Amino acid sequence: AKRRVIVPIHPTPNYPAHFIKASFTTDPLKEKQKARFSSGGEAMREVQMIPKNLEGERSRRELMSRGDTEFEALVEFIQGASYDQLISGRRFKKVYDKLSENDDTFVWLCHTAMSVLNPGDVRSRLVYNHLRTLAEAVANGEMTLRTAFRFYESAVRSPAYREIAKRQMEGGAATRLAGISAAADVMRRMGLTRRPMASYFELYQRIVERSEAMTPWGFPPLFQFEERLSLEPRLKFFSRASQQALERRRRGHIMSAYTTLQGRRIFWIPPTWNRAGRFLGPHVTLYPGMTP
Amino acid sequence: RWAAKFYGRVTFGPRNYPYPSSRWLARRFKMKKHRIIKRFRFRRYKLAAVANLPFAKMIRVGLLPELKSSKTKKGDDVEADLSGRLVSAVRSSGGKKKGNRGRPKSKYQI
Amino acid sequence: KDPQGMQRPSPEVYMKLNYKNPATISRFLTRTGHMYPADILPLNPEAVAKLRV
Amino acid sequence: MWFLYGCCLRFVLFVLCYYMSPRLPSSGNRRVLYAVFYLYIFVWCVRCFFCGIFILSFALFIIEGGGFIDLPGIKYYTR
Amino acid sequence: RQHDSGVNQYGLKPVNAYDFINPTNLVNFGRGTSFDNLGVRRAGRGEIDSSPSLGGSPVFTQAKLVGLSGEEQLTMCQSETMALRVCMARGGQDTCERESRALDACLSRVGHLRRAMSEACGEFNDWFIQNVSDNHTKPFQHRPHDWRHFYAQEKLVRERQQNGHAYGRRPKQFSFGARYVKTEGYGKRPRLPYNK
Amino acid sequence: IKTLDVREYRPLATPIEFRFYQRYANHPNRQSGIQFLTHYNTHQRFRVNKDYIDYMHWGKEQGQARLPHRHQR
Amino acid sequence: VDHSFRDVVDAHFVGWKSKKIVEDIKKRHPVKITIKEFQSPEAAIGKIREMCQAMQRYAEEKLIYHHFTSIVANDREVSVSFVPSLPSEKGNSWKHIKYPGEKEWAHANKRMEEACRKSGRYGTYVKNNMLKPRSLGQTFFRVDKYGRKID
RNA sequence: GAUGCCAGCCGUUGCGGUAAUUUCUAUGCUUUUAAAUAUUAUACAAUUAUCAUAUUAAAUUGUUAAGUGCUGAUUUAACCAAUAAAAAUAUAAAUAAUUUUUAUUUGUUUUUAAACACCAUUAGGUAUAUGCAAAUAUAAAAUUAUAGUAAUUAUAAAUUAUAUUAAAAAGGUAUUGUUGCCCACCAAUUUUUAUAAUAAAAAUAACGUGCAGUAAUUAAUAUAUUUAUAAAAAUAUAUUUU
């Protein structure tokens, strides 16, 4: 076969075991495959969503001196408008997630208000406490959205429930104002938000936006909350991207896939002459225009 | 029928295999059956069984010296009256008769 | 409301569905005499029987 | 264990020592001893294996059966 | 939590033994897989593996419903043309003398109208994906062999009539002239199977 | 037949039906399943010579075309 | 109606192939053999000849009347052509199965040698010293896993 | 330390290709210490289980249909003979439980002087439920194998680029995967035997005809008539493991 032999690279002072084992493989049935990635100091925490395991005084110092994280994220996003920095989608996305942190509780309470025909008297402290304790444990991750909604629609309300209902409701589906007032009260009693009006605003606007859909108040129980297989976030039900619903539009060059770097592209991983055929850099401009 | 429909457990997959038999095993056993049918059709296999014989103990007409195909082998010993019946009937199946219920008439019948 | 067409035709149409009644026959057959298939014109089974015969 | 005929070890008689090739992926030239023995007045032939060693010519062989080896069809081995 | 629970930082999350023995399935579902679309064998719009499925079978006639590219009539400029048998039979290709103003007047509404109908069908897919599509997780029904058990029923019945013996046996094909040339004494109209 | 596997075959998705055959049925005319809670003279709803179930049309009112109608339960 | 085949051939193929093509001769149909993939003009002509000696050996028993026309042997081809007698008038006039003879055999052989030296190409395909493994089963001598004694 | 697909280990997947923790030896080492190895007895299901051990079932016959002008390029991809126009009707209605175990019974049917169709080929036969003929619809104990042969085989969703949407839906017997696998006849071999041209089956790794299966080059699978260098095909049925 003219068989190829690769002597295994052994660890050295210079070339450590980790690199010599992942940057190199002695079995050449993987050669020239592609570039893998992994995350280190802060990329790992950013992706893995591992919350800091708290402590007493020290974690509480780091945690108390936090201040308005949503704002400080915004500060860090805009500061990319200064001279020495560029506005970065990574900053915008840290802002976007620091603002969309309470997605779970919001999508839930919206489902509760608007998908639960006849939810007792939610303003009555009984069902209000069911609501508070469930949404409280929907945030804080102790409960899932699906199981918590079942706990809500299953909690104990009033004996002879259908019989009390068929006296108050023709088709069974009551007025939703008590419900949404209860949910806004929920998220403003539980400090789900640092800036209070935000709770109500999302609670209100997500509902308003859904009010436009066909079957705007039915949800297929599978996709409705979390499960194995879900919908893309543009297609989630009470989500923030559902209004960001759009798409892209492409006119490719005759040579468009080749030039994948030539444009004014931001490079995280800069090219070097070993992969770079004739590319010059994202700053060069062969065809300049005169201007003061 | 005296024939064996399945020459082999064609249906063998895991229980609940929602079909009689996978196409693989069906092809395997159709190869076994093509071998059996070509063996029979090419050694000109002929069997027979007549009334008031023990119908389970078949007659090997192709193992008769009047219809033998081999030369070094000896086919079978059969009473003379029954032999004159059978082999005359084998000759009789050499043609199908217009004016009766027709029959599938093969070359390998003769 | 009645999918497989148990309520089509109207009771009069039966009594007028006989053999001497091509007039009320031909109001359930295609322009060529074909029956409209059961997925398409869902007829009552008695109607279909009286109509074929 | 058909030819062991039930006893734990069966004695037989050398005839030929022919070489058979094992079943793939394995590779070798395995020593198949075509033996015989009379038992229950019929006399029988026993195609066997040889894992033992031989110093003196002895058509006394103690065939005890074993597992499967890379050879297809040899259930008997030597003691 | 902060992420969806049907994926792990390595792919889809394995639930049962199938996932754990064949973990290709968790990270590969067609030539259009993307780490956001993982496992979800509907992926984006326009890419490959994107079609919504209505109860198993997948959907590819989404415009052919609205009437874009299916049964294009639109009639707005069509009635105009069919009207102008003068400027239909002239050099059919001018702002001819008078009527090609009206032709473009109709088509100016055609354009806006079909943009509205197309956005309708776009929202239709983005709705039917929410509240109807199984995402190909349920078995097909567009073939006559997902109704194996509906043909078993009307085989079992015809058996029961055939004395519980000739299950699946059918009536042998007779002829063109079977009931009217065959002779006296042999059943001209094919009996059921269990008569023979 | 050739008595040994010619194929390095290893298909990995074992249907729950192929394993737990004591519970699901993949034969046609056995999908009706075990219905002890009918009235019929059997528990094996596919052996009841009585009411062969139309499969495409029923079920609008009773769940599936298996289960008995809500006027016979 | 041509019938070609490769060089290395068992008497199995010779018998039933000559039988196939000569039955074709019995069917009025045109007849031509050729090897195109031959290791040498000698193997090519030998295969032609074993085929023809099966052909005519069958033809005499089966009572067929067909006459040979040409043998077009070249660098890249060793062919025979045959032509049958369609009606029995032609047959009875010429109750003849006509195949070429030893002279034409050797002469076409020499012609092909002269052309294959004009070309310097002696075989359109080559048998390889690459031996595939072979297991000898019953054997009174050690053998390599390819079929050669262990010495 | 030798051995190098060999010799050998082999409960076992498998190992042994010049660095074998899978051989031999040496040496240590290892153990929970009546030693090691060989042959046997050692506790189906019952709620759902596809090929040949049925039985409470309504059914059987209905005499309808289509035909003479004229001058000739239809049919199919390509041929080939040589008139071609044609076959619809009937409901209630037969009670269930008890020993028919040969009884009956599960798609070959009479006739062109009446045709389609199919097959062979210009020169015909066949042209469709009166004998005969159990047979899928599961009573179950691992594959093969005539119930003696090897140690299993079958299997399903992962993975595989183009079928005119305002770019969108597709398979694998392969498991880096079509330059992939398998398949049969075609040679020696072996081993058991119910020795039909040349017997049957089990294992295997030559040569050769091919390319028969993987939706695969006229879709495949079961049953059957015919056909034959072999994988198979024409035909007639069903059926989608298409």
TrEMBL record, chain A:
Lineage: superkingdom: Eukaryota
Protein name (database record): Uncharacterized protein
Organism: Trypanosoma cruzi (strain CL Brener)
From TrEMBL, chain D:
Keyword Membrane (UniProt): yes
Keywords: Membrane, Mitochondrion, Transmembrane, Transmembrane helix
TM region(s), chain numbering: 33-63
InterPro entries tied to this protein: Ribosomal_uS12m
Pfam families: Ribosomal_S12
Name by which UniProt lists this protein: Ribosome protein S12
Record lineage: Eukaryota, Discoba, Euglenozoa, Kinetoplastea, Metakinetoplastina
TrEMBL record, chain F:
The protein's name in its UniProt record: Enoyl-CoA hydratase/isomerase domain-containing protein
Organism annotation: Trypanosoma cruzi (strain CL Brener)
Residues of the full protein shown: 27 to 99 of 1181
Automatic annotation (TrEMBL), chain G:
Listed name of the protein: Uncharacterized protein
Full protein stretch here: 226 to 376 of 376
